[PDB]
Design a protein around this ligand. Structure first.
Ligand SMILES: CCCCCCCC/C=C/CCCCCCCC(=O)O[C@@H](COC(=O)CCCCCCCCCCCCCCC)COP(=O)([O-])OCC[N+](C)(C)C
Ligand SMILES: CCCCCCCCCCCCCCCC(=O)OCCCOP(=O)(O)OCC[N+](C)(C)C
Ligand SMILES: CCCCCCCCCCCCCCCC(=O)OCCCOP(=O)(O)OCC[N+](C)(C)C
Ligand SMILES: CCCCCCCCCCCCCCCC(=O)OCCCOP(=O)(O)OCC[N+](C)(C)C
Ligand SMILES: CCCCCCCCCCCCCCCC(=O)OCCCOP(=O)(O)OCC[N+](C)(C)C
Ligand SMILES: Nc1ncnc2c1ncn2[C@@H]1O[C@H](COP(=O)(O)OP(=O)(O)O)[C@@H](O)[C@H]1O
Ligand SMILES: Nc1ncnc2c1ncn2[C@@H]1O[C@H](COP(=O)(O)OP(=O)(O)O)[C@@H](O)[C@H]1O
Lengths: 17, 699, 698, 18
């Protein structure tokens, strides 16, 4: 239970590659 | 448990590699090419949403949070995919395994297992974490296969060639070992007793032996070259034949360079399939025989030789890993420099306009300096390795001569025996050195075999298709979309809810702004992609149950992005069709109105089009595509000309609102849904969004 | 009289190479770059008109005709230029040199001197011919410069390092030659007399000698690596700095790969600037010393070794050329295969739509078969070369041992002396073999040096500038095009006598169809290109007499082909200038309404746009370009009224007439002329073409 | 004088090299 659970909009925003 | 780091195969599979590493940590091994498509990896990369979706699809309980520096010190799950930004340029994914105290150990898919200070990691860390647990429905397993065993099956039709190479190598080695005693016979027998008459006969015999050895080397070199050519051709053609059958989501999620770069993997696989196999099965026997002979000559000198080869092996093994790390850094720096050079040459207009020539010179100078530094690091590594190997070899030779002279003085051997030992050394140390030098080759070939053969496991387009129908032959009818949804690989949904019916044998036009999705409907109607939810019906029949060949044959799509391949004008028009009459070709070219400039071109319908029709203009290339589509004689025609029968359905995709006033029906696509539909007059009178965009654009 | 065949440096310079070959045959030698730029060679090659134009410029009298097989045997100038359709896939230029007894002799710039039959030549021949002959105004000479001279002049600052490498190499050679006598001391003196303590002493001494030799090799290798990197960096940076100053006709006429391959040419040059010089000096001295020592040991064995190295040199020299030809063929086949693979992968959707997977598979299989066939021909060449070299080396070693045993039996030598001779052979055969092996390295370096250094002789953009008065400080005023003519290279003219006037501070627009040449006026206004006839005037003064810095600084051009460089948003918006404060960039972004999307980014004004703004799309890159142009603060702005000063001229280029109605003046560009000029109401009246395009467009 | 003289407009149609 660390920090704040990110929403689908925020999940789709932190990328990599 | 052990820390698993799965290295990347391409430049944009960071999240897939991290998910694979975490899955393998808990005992679930899968190919990277399957996890890469589960995560929705594409050209841009992977987002945390794809990682969560794939992990939940893998049985893991997945969650995504944004944390702070102090949140790390708290206790949580071990694997912990994390987001970083290296060089402040591009985002990246790593796996933070454990936090002992102020030290962060991470599996980086691009480098390996590395360690940062807490401050350094918190500096590069972006605060985003992907928490993973092995769920409740997570089952352990190993769903991979040995690629090297798979590619070793190409040797089965070449058993005769392999046997001939083995026999030639055995004869070559035997003749060389026999010829290594010439100097012993010289010094011990002929020179000592002044046998002039014998000298000539023995010398001629050894010359004949050497000539036979040369002939055997010639023959086996030809055989090895032919074997390698055959294996390369087989692997390359198998890979290409499979790639040509894969769905469109394979090509849209990968670059052209990624697909083409695996043609160089075939040579790397061949190296260990053929050369390494030959080296093992030949040099093992050769080294055993040479060591037996050396031990027969002298035990102490054989022990010295064994120590020499052991030291060489230790040095080479120690220098193996550092050398491959520096080469990768050089390749990365060279890629950066090449990108900078190409990008500055292509944008010379802007550089000259803004006077940014000194800036470009400084940037290129800095990148050249970085490349030179990396090259010097690798060169220093090679120089150190060569110096140590040379020390070992030269001091070993001197010590061998020293101990041989000592033994000759003591009477254990003779001078001719010492020189014969010096030759049989050349027939002992070389096989063991060749066997030792197989580690980089085998490692590279294993990596290449996995990289190439994980794609051969991918299901083809025909395999994924369900049962077809042998009673649907014509696609004429009504095209209807039932609650169609679509996304381009775990991204924002292009279409949110699509409901539209296209009347039979009519002309319709879908209108919208840039990025509305009209081209997506065009692709979905041809089964290039499948809707994630909904259905597409053509004359009361599901789009999935119609034969794929019929779907591709009876539907034509002409876009502004035409594709012309190198070949004659007639060859481009006759793409995929072999037996076609020339009268049909000229009729289609006349209907497409391309029959004028083609005749203006030399050779008429044989003009070779250099570099994808570079000589032709943009307006001309479109007309060839229209002629090709008309030659296909389709039932549905999607344009972005009109001389077909009225029964064919015609669909028009355009952002302008003027050329489609006479269309029978107009569908307005906004925000991924069909907001308005009907004829032009009805939409104009309806005072909908069509009226707004008509007043804004066309006034 | 020798047949001169100038080879190609690139793919599109066949006609330039042919004209250079003819000129050299007639006694005029020039660099290929100047001839290429006179012929109008570009990315599509050159045509006949360029060849006759350059020949007339070069003092020749030339003409172009279309002949037949009946005319290929009459009396005419023996050296001519012929057009071929090689492979029925590529048009190409060859030079005809002699026809007699029905055998056509042609210099092909891509192959060399070749001889076809009448049938084959007439099969490839197009029938076109260029006839040339020296005229009254013909002047011979040699205007080409030696490039090895200057690329070795780069070695002048690094002479101390070369001297250190030389001294280390001589010390290494002396230590190795001294250590070559260990086997002689063993067999002749230590083993024979059973001296055990002396054995240990001499063995330790020779071990120390070998260790010193290893240290010297370490030091020399470090120095050589550093020298090579220094020379590579110097050549590369010189080439790049000169290239960045060349005019835009240098970049329009060449591809990106053509400009980039000179970076590999730099390393090719260095391999002979550093490697060949040190090799020649060190190995010549070492070979002489080793030969003297071998002759002292025994004359007959020395003669045998000399014959060995002579045979090796003969074999290598004979095999040199076919290996190069096979390698060239292999590279061509690899290029064709890569092109086919890239085309098939890029256009996979069309292949799937038309069901041409089997045809593409068969075509790629055929090209792979061709590549493999070309690779086996070079493989067999190397196998034959290695087999002959191995025969020579092994039989020479056997014969050396045979003759040495004969001499020892006859008392002319000793066994230790024979073993010492075998040890010393490494200091005579290796240097001469290395000297022989310099033939492929020096020819390649010469070709690379010519390729790279012919560009460095080209005039830069500032050099070609005329006298510029330093009184003009602003470009605000009427823009006049007087009788402006232009053509891209030696092609059909684009602008045929443009004559127009753009008022001061008014928002005017240029309309026309696609490909009319509207962008050409903008490019000429910015002085990227100069008009071949006519003049362009800003504020009365001629454009040629205003400093290039002011022209490039006070004129901005934003088109659809926006280029964004790999860097932060602030870095791209601050291209060219760095002494800019953030409030100015904020104001420009607000004016270009680009502020919002930059704000909603991971790092506002610091987001790194990888792969030339791959993150952004068409619509944001244009806004970034507009913001950058506004930061430029131009007196003339060309677009495809944000802030400004109400006297800054704005010129709009478009083909959709809807957005031009409010423009003060509208210039219709047809057939290379400004046919109609006036307001929207005036032109839409009974004027002619403008009404036609207005009613057709909407 | 072997053949028919090409015109200045048709000369540009006789190209080569790419
Ligand atoms: C201090 C000592 C330093 C010495 C270093 C000096 C080394 C510098 C040397 C430089 C050599 C430069 C040669 C270039 C010119 C060749 C021209 C040519 O056309 O060749 C042609 C033939 O060639 C031959 O047939 C034989 C060549 C004669 C070379 C003599 C021996 C080479 C060196 C001896 C060394 C002795 C040293 C002794 C030392 C004691 C090539 O034609 P092709 O198309 O390729 O194929 C031919 C096929 N065909 C056969 C069917 C026809
Ligand atoms: C005299 C008694 C000896 C008895 C021993 C019997 C064993 C016989 C074997 C001999 C050795 C021969 C094997 C070597 C084969 C070889 O090495 O073959 C040379 C190729 C010659 O052909 P090549 O010159 O390459 O063709 C033209 C190429 N080029 C010049 C155009 C470049
Ligand atoms: C008294 C009896 C006398 C009999 C004399 C007979 C001598 C016969 C000798 C043949 C042996 C030849 C086998 C050679 C095998 C070989 O030479 O194999 C190379 C090893 C390469 O693999 P390696 O370097 O060990 O990998 C490193 C891995 N790791 C440590 C990094 C984890
Ligand atoms: C009488 C019997 C005759 C048999 C003859 C057979 C010949 C045997 C020759 C094998 C040579 C193989 C040697 C391999 C040694 C080896 O493989 O050991 C290397 C050390 C591990 O180094 P490594 O982990 O790879 O990396 C660096 C890590 N570190 C050390 C820097 C910390
Ligand atoms: C294309 C493949 C060809 C390969 C061939 C390579 C072979 C290289 C060998 C060169 C010819 C060597 C033959 C020379 C033989 C010779 O030269 O034999 C020396 C000994 C003769 O004795 P000699 O030197 O005349 O001194 C006599 C004094 N004394 C003893 C009477 C006191
Ligand atoms: N090959 C692709 N891969 C991923 N996304 C794509 C691809 N092609 C289009 N898209 C996305 O789908 C959306 C639909 O755009 P598109 O249908 O091409 O517009 P239009 O209907 O005007 O042609 C676009 O916003 C684009 O970002
Ligand atoms: N960089 C170039 N190199 C060679 N030819 C060119 C180049 N740019 C344009 N052209 C040719 O010159 C003509 C100029 O037209 P252009 O200025 O592109 O029209 P518009 O401004 O309406 O797009 C075009 O027909 C094109 O064929």
């Amino acid at each position: 239970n660390i920090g704040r659970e990110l929403t689908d909009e925020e999940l789709m925003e932190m990328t990599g590659g | 448990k052990k820390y698993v780091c799965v290295r990347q195969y391409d430049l944009t599979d960071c999240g897939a590699a991290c998910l694979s590493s975490i899955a393998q940590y808990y005992g679930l091994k899968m190919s990277l090419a399957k996890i890469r498509e589960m995560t929705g990896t594409d050209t841009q990369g992977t987002n945390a949403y794809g990682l969560i979706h794939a992990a939940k699809q893998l049985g893991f309980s997945a969650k995504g949070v944004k944390a702070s520096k102090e949140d790390l010190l708290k206790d949580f799950r071990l694997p912990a995919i994390a987001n970083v930004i290296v060089d402040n340029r591009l985002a990246h994914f790593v796996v933070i395994y454990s936090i002992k105290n102020r030290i962060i150990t991470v599996a980086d898919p691009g480098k390996g297992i590395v360690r940062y200070s807490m401050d350094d990691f918190c500096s590069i860390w972006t605060g985003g974490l992907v928490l993973l647990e092995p769920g409740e429905a997570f089952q352990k397993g190993d769903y991979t296969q040995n690629m090297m065993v798979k590619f070793a099956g190409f040797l089965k039709p070449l058993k005769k060639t392999v046997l001939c190479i083995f026999l030639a190598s055995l004869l070559y080695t035997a003749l060389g070992i026999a010829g290594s005693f010439y100097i012993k016979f010289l010094f011990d027998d002929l020179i000592k007793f002044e046998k002039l008459n014998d000298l000539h006969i023995i010398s001629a015999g050894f010359a004949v032996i050497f000539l036979l050895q040369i002939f055997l080397n010639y023959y086996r070199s030809i055989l090895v070259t032919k074997l390698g050519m055959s294996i390369d051709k087989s692997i390359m053609m198998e890979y290409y034949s499979h790639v040509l059958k894969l769905p469109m989501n394979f090509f849209n999620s990968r670059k052209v360079g990624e697909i083409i770069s695996r043609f160089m993997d075939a040579s790397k696989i061949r190296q260990a399939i053929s050369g390494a196999t030959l080296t093992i099965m030949i040099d093992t026997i050769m080294a055993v025989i040479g060591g037996i002979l050396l031990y027969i000559q002298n035990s102490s000198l054989f022990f010295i030789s064994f120590i020499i080869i052991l030291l060489y092996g230790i040095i080479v093994t120690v220098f193996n890993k550092p050398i491959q790390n520096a080469n990768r850094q050089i390749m990365e720096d060279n890629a950066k420099l090449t990108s900078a050079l190409v990008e500055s040459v292509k944008g010379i207009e802007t550089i000259k306009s803004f006077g940014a020539e000194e800036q470009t010179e400084k940037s290129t100078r800095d990148k050249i300096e970085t490349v030179m530094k990396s090259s010097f690091k690798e060169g220093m590594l090679y120089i150190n390795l060569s110096s140590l190997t040379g020390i070992v070899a030269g001091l070993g030779g001197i010590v061998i001569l020293w101990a041989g002279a000592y033994n000759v003085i003591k009477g254990n051997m003779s001078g001719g025996q010492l020189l014969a030992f010096n030759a049989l050394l050349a027939y002992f140390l070389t096989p063991v050195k060749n066997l030792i030098d197989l580690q980089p080759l085998i490692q590279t070939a294993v990596v290449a075999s996995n990289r190439l053969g994980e794609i051969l496991e991918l299901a083809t387009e025909k395999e994924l298709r369900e049962d077809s129908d042998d009673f649907v032959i014509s696609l004429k009818g009504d095209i209807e979309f039932r609650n169609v949804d679509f996304r381009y690989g775990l991204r924002k949904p292009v279409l949110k809810n699509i409901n539209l019916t296209i009347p039979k044998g009519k002309t319709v036009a879908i209108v919208g702004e840039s990025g509305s999705g009209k081209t997506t409907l065009a692709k979905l109607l041809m089964n290039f992609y499948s809707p994630e939810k909904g259905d597409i019906l053509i004359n009361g029949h599901s789009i999935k149950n119609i034969s794929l060949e019929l779907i591709r044959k009876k539907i034509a799509f002409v876009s502004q992005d035409v594709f012309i391949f190198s070949g004659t004008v007639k060859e481009n028009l006759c793409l995929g069709n072999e037996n076609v009459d020339m009268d049909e070709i000229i009729k289609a070219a006349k209907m497409a109105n391309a029959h004028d400039f083609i005749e203006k071109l030399p050779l008429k319908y044989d003009t070779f089009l250099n570099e994808s029709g570079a000589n032709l203009s943009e307006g001309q290339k479109q007309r060839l595509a229209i002629a090709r589509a008309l030659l296909k004689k389709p039932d549905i025609l999607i344009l972005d000309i009109y001389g077909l029968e009225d029964d064919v359905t015609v669909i028009i995709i355009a952002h302008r609102l003027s050329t489609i006033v006479n269309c029978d029906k107009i569908y307005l696509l906004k925000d991924g849904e069909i907001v308005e539909s009907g004829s032009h007059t009805e939409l104009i009178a309806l005072k909908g969004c069509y009226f707004k965009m008509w007043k804004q654009t066309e006034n």
